[PDB]
């Protein structure tokens, strides 16, 4: 029942705009449309508790770093979407995200979901990444990364197929209800 603030962040070129369009209108456009920032406040109740998701859009542009990092302090929860198998993405995550959230707030619940995994159905990207001599991230290292970021249980949901999203939000709420000591 206790309403809390929320911030959603992510990597570059991952699909925030389609996520917001789907959230506000229940659709899935493949067209790319620029968007600066957004906030959605929706009233959904899970496990008998009425909690409002104060959604927030964040942009990776260099210009608005002052605006973006202003609200990062005293934020209570994150929803992050990232390309699952991009070594530069994991490198940037280790360099930027995890150390700061660990040093600033030792007790900030974090919900993490990976993206860019249905592209196996599209051979174009497979051929694109084959010519550059890139190998997929080993599952053992992925699980080690999931368990080493102070996360109770890491889970993933589909945006294109719309699979697990409600389950992911429910498990995040359950984890926040009974987090680590």
């Amino acid at each position: 029942m206790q309403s809390i603030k929320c911030v959603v962040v992510g990597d570059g070129a991952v699909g925030k705009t389609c996520l917001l369009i789907c959230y506000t209108t229940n659709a899935f456009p493949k067209e790319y449309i620029p968007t600066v920032f957004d906030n959605y406040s929706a009233q959904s109740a899970v496990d008998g508790r009425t909690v409002n998701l104060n959604l927030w859009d964040t942009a990776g542009l260099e210009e608005y770093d002052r605006l973006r990092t202003l609200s990062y302090p005293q934020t209570n929860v994150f929803v992050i979407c990232f390309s699952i198998a991009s070594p530069p993405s994991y490198e940037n995550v280790r360099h930027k995200w995890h150390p700061e959230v660990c040093h600033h707030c030792p007790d900030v619940p974090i919900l993490l979901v990976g993206t860019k995994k249905d592209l196996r159905a599209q051979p174009d990207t497979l051929r694109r990444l084959k010519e550059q001599g890139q190998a997929p991230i080993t599952p053992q290292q992925g699980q080690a990364l999931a368990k080493q970021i102070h996360a109770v249980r890491y889970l993933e949901c589909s945006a294109l197929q719309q699979d697990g999203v409600k389950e992911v939000f429910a498990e995040a709420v359950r984890a926040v209800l009974n987090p680590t000591p």
Partner: protein
């Protein structure tokens, strides 16, 4: 046939707090806007709040 414009999206922020959304129609008098804002946010003393622009 242009689409109706009676529905718009606007987030009203707070200093140090995260936004909440409402539909505001400017044609109606500001008294109606204040009443609807207070009804939506369950805030009493409608005469102790007003509207200002957070742009430049």
């Amino acid at each position: 046939m242009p689409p109706p414009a009676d529905i718009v999206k606007v987030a009203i922020e707070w200093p140090g707090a995260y936004p909440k959304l409402m539909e505001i129609d400017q044609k109606k008098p500001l008294s109606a806007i204040i009443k609807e804002v207070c009804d939506g946010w369950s805030l009493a003393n409608h005469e102790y709040f007003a509207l200002q622009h957070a742009d430049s």
